[PDB]
Amino acid sequence: GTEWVVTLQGADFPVTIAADHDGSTVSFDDGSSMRVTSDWTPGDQLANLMVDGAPLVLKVGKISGGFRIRTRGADLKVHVRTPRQAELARLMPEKLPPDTSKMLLCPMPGLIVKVDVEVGQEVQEGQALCTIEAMKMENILRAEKKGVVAKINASAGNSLAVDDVIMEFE
Amino acid sequence: LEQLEDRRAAARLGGGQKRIDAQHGRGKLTARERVDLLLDEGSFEEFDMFVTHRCTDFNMQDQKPAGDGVVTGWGTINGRVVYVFSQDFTVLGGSVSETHSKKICKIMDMAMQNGAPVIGINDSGGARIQEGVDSLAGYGEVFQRNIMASGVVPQISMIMGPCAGGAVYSPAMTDFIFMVKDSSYMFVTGPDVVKTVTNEQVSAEELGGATTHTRKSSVADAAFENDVEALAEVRRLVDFLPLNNREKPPVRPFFDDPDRIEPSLDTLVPDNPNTPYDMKELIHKLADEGDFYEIQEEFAKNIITGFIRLEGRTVGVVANQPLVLAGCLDIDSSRKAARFVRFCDAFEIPLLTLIDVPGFLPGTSQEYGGVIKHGAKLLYAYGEATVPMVTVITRKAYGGAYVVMSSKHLRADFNYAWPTAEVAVMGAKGATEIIHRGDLGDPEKIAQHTADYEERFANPFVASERGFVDEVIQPRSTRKRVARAFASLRNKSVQMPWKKHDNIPL
Amino acid sequence: LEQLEDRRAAARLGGGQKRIDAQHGRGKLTARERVDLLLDEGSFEEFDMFVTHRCTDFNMQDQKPAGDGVVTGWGTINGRVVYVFSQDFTVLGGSVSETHSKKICKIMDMAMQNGAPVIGINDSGGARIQEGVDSLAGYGEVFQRNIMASGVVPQISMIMGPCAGGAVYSPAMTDFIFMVKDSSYMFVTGPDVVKTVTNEQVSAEELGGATTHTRKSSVADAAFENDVEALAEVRRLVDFLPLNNREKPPVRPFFDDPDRIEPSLDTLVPDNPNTPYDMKELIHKLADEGDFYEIQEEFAKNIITGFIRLEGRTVGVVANQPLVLAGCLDIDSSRKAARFVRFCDAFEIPLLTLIDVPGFLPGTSQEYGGVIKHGAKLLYAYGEATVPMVTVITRKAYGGAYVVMSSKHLRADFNYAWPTAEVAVMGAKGATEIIHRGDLGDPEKIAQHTADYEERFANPFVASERGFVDEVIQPRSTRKRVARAFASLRNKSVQMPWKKHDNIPL
Amino acid sequence: LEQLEDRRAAARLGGGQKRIDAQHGRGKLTARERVDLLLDEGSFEEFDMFVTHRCTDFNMQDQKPAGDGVVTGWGTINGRVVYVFSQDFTVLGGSVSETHSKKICKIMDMAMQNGAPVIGINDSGGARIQEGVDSLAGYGEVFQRNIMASGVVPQISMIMGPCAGGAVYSPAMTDFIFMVKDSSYMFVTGPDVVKTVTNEQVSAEELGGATTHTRKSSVADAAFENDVEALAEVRRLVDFLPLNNREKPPVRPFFDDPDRIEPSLDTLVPDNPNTPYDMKELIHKLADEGDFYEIQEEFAKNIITGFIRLEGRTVGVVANQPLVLAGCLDIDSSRKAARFVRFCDAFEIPLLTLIDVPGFLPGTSQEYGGVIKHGAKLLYAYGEATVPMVTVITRKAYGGAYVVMSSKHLRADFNYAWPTAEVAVMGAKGATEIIHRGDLGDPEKIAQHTADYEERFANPFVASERGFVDEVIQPRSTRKRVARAFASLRNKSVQMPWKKHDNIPL
């Protein structure tokens, strides 16, 4: 196709493409048109382009409907869909993350090798909490969401089965 | 005749605009809209559009909608022919009747005579009760076809609504089952009967929701965020697959180099053996443009199975995950990979097996659960497999598991090893306790006996002396090693003994 | 030379007379005595009697017994060639080495090149640790062979001692696994490791003893009282089996009549539908001389699988047991029958399927356990099977299960029915609640709506009008009907589409 | 249930006792009575006895008889399995519906899967109009089946009532068509339409009666006196035929000697060349117990096609009849033998060809009629045939015809000749007028030139010098020569080039 709809920072850009050998010419609704030129090719994690003569360096990643682009402090999913794709995608429900328990349950029946968090400490989403030793293999358990340690009830050398609450969060 | 145009447009309406909204309300696309996003823009040809059911019981004949609940036909995905059927939930709940199945059978029979995949989009309330045994027979004909086409033409199942009762058994037999995160579900018996019989009360989503199946039951291969990505991701899959069991995996351009070196790899296996590492890093760096379409990601996480391309050709990959259960092999991980292996084989897709398994997971749970049978399945798979098999052992390869992970004894082609590999009967410790009994009461003898076994056997070199490891390579060069290894195997041709079929443990 | 006679006699002594006593002490016979009772009196030819291992580590070379732990060779069972190996526990514990395997491989390779079954008598301590990876490799070659012969020549496994570790996987892949009531056991991981890793304490017999496996794990097919009957029963089994996948089931004289009538059958189905009856009664009366060799009797008891003969020819049988779980199909019953069917088909043995199933067993346990996949297996099995298939529905045939039990939609040849048969989408009750919603608040409407569905659909006649039941027969004549039905199918020949192999769910 | 017995007996009544009489009134037996005499006493197993049609138009659903117009199933003829369907004229005229055909397909599909002939007993008023296209589709599935089985399993059609419209095309494609002297008939279009479109007035019997077809159209293979002999002669026929294209002609005891001599034969060829003789005398004397089952006796009488046995094995025979058209080959004689040859070959039945043809029958009628194409058919048949081919030229073998009649150039195996044989380019007369033009004005030159061609070329010896006649034998020994000739060819195996199918002229 030639017609696409680029969906950025919550903004839709119905666009048309025409390309030959040199580069490509993207045209927007308002009649304006940019000229993209690039070395890029699938797989390249970094893209050095030349849009409207001015350098544009991006960090690329694959995503179902396009890619994850990162320019300045920017970092956003850029969906490149076709008009009917886009049209329908708009009928798709808005995903709401799962719920989190404020209780860190032990998922592997092993031995607690170390706890690197104190009571009343504040933790970042995904931060290393403790470390259970499985079968001569270390497993690092981490904060689900940012929160603050209510109470701990296990320490080095401890040996807990599944579900045993390791820590509690307020 | 613009009359034709009318009939056509009428049919396209399904159970009506009011029901279409209903559907959309559930965040669910319509049968037709799903077909629309699946197939190459304007390439869909529909069949049996005005088909009506033949029921006369329960005044069923007063409601004879066109299409009878399912949209069937063909089209292409990136120019390649594909057969499809999307159940239309808005028409009699997309309930299975004699004629609904018949429509599905026509394109299945067509997919088989022409050697092209079949994509099934299930979104049905279940059997059409009023049809009596006719609904059952309808299922039968689909089932039979599903069976005859197993390993003959790819059968990808897409569950995008409800799938209950006998129905579940069809997707069951297809090669893949994808579900849509929250709007879909499947189970043989409904939540209400589970209550009346088990006194247990549970919601459809709890009983057989996308999540329950993508990580507890072992039934689904992935749960997509919604209808749109689900359809997008399925084409992505189809792009890797061969069109049938005669041709080999498809080829396409690739902007990567078979001689790419990843020095980073040289330090992926941590020095401390109790410290994991993510096996997936390796996969990505080996995989072509770093693209890895994983299968059953959220289940049996102690093992990874997926698709990648090398020099633009599809290569299946089975690998151990140290991050979970310490890369152990267990009933579930076995069942998970075993099937993946067999599918790849049946369809001439090569296998790359990345190894780091300690042994199988201990437990009464496992033994009483039948690891003796399930565990065997993965072994059976590699034994049986005849596509090209390349293997790279990154660290641990001990005993039985060592053998099962595409060992040279299962007739794999290339058996590579990282210097950090350790192939042996069992760990130095336990090995020592068996070999040296009268020496335990001397904690320095056994402490030394182990220190020797370790120094003398925990490595890839004794295996090398034997020929079991064709070579020990520098980690950075793995992509280069493996790519050409397969390259040379493109012509591979090996014969298994004649038989109606196998008897693999169930 | 009488020197030869000496060496010979020498070898025959195994780990020596003191150990031979030890063995006998555990009520266990010796490798050689087991062989002796298995093969036709004096028909055993032994091979590699003086083979010695090639180990040099751990002073292993100072103990080079003859035979190296296993007795291999060939002989006959009722005059028919059979290949065998009996592990000699008294010799290095019958531990598996490079050379022990090799010995087993020799007769496996020979069984395949000549189309004769292989009887494996396992009674080993496990791998020969001192051999390092050579012990692993040894297992490999056995496995590979086990795999290649699957469904090509029968592989009957006899466990008469311990079977630990990788080893379990071989019998795992053979077509049958029989164990000896108390002197045998098998598990992937040892009870002691189960402790140090699960902190669970359990005895070998508890972990993987004959009972645990013939009843809980789904691994063994039967537990024999002792070494002597175990061997007698194995020959019995072999007498039914075909020697390989080329010839068809063996024939032999039979002192019974294909036209025999059992009037008793006419009252086998009880009047009250909540009252069971023993499906096995039927089996016996149909079976030729009333002989029925049951497989996995003590497992998945809600389904029966066995062998019988008709007009002196082998006929495999799958039947529903009302006595247990009310003849329901469930993960286990499914896995149990599924494999039986595939083996019988891979080996040209016809199938007789006796039906009386209500549906599948409801439950969170089942769905979370994956019935969608396991349930399918039996379906897959019948769908794939091409031997002659005859069916007799004695009573219940409802929904999905109805279809799965060798229905006519799976292309069975003869679909017979007793007048007491009831084939329908579901029970009258549930059916009614679905078909007549706006009628529940009137407990007489639904009481009547059900009374009609019951009167109009719960029977075999609607299926008859459709052709799905070739005929409704008088119970007493079943033996007569079925016998000739199979007779006329002796020439059956059906072709499944070409494919490397199937992709059946695992 | 004695309820079953009632339903059963109810069904057995067909269109009722009043119609049964009507039927019997026309000298016609009932569907079931015909089946009863066809199959080995009590060996019939009926299928789909309670099948009912699925029509809803024209109040068709108020008349839902059991069986829906046709009796299907299997049984044996002299112990050999045979599949059958007898149309029940008393039931909705034995009119073809969706379901009536389905029943026929079930046993056609069964005949093919088990390799057994299909005997079709047509006695139908034609399609079931109320069913609309479903009646058309009904025919379709039969036709298709009829086609796939052509030359794979013998298809004997028996017409014992009316057969009109598309219907005729089924028996058309079977291997044999027998009709019952006065009670049967068949034609694509009815006498009444023949009127309204041709203004020609003709009766059904005239249009397509047993006689019209057994001697004018070339459609039937024989007209039997009545229903009873019809049935009896069909089994007789079946006793000669192989059960399918895999096995070879059946064998049975034979009280006759392969070395029998018929001196009477030495004078069968009359001295005067203008006097016929009955080629059939020879056939009977050679035939085993003098038994000769003739095909299409009353048609293309200038040629004979039939079956006989030798040493108790089936042998097909094509031979020229001097008594008619002077044994000329003509469009019809050609079409008549051509197919016989092809059926015999398609089914491994050897051929014995007895020769005495002068050439082809001259005429504008022949040329405009396409002898170029029809004539070739027989040639094509022998050229293609690979079963064993023995030939005996009794007298005349001139030109083209000589070649067509299983000549040695068509790769026949034995090309025997009686001393009275005369193989040559054309007669001495004609030959002479061409070879010697400038000599006609001298009636003594040509009178002498002929006398020389006659004395030098009209015999079997010039052909013998060439090897074209393997040997010239004494007439009395023919039975002996031919019997062992075939005996020695029992192993014959010859390969034709690979191809989907032939393109023989139509």
Ligand SMILES: *C(=O)CCCC[C@@H]1SC[C@@H]2NC(=O)N[C@@H]21
């Ligand atoms: C150390 O904590 C004890 C060793 C644990 C045994 C490990 S667990 C998985 C490996 N495979 C196996 O059967 N045992 C090994």
Ligand SMILES: *C(=O)CCCC[C@@H]1SC[C@@H]2NC(=O)N[C@@H]21
């Ligand atoms: C009484 O009828 C209570 C309902 C039980 C339903 C039975 S239990 C097993 C059968 N299969 C199934 O899914 N439901 C049936």
Ligand SMILES: *C(=O)CCCC[C@@H]1SC[C@@H]2NC(=O)N[C@@H]21
């Ligand atoms: C004698 O009366 C004249 C010769 C007639 C020719 C005969 S008629 C049929 C034979 N075939 C042929 O072409 N010529 C022969």
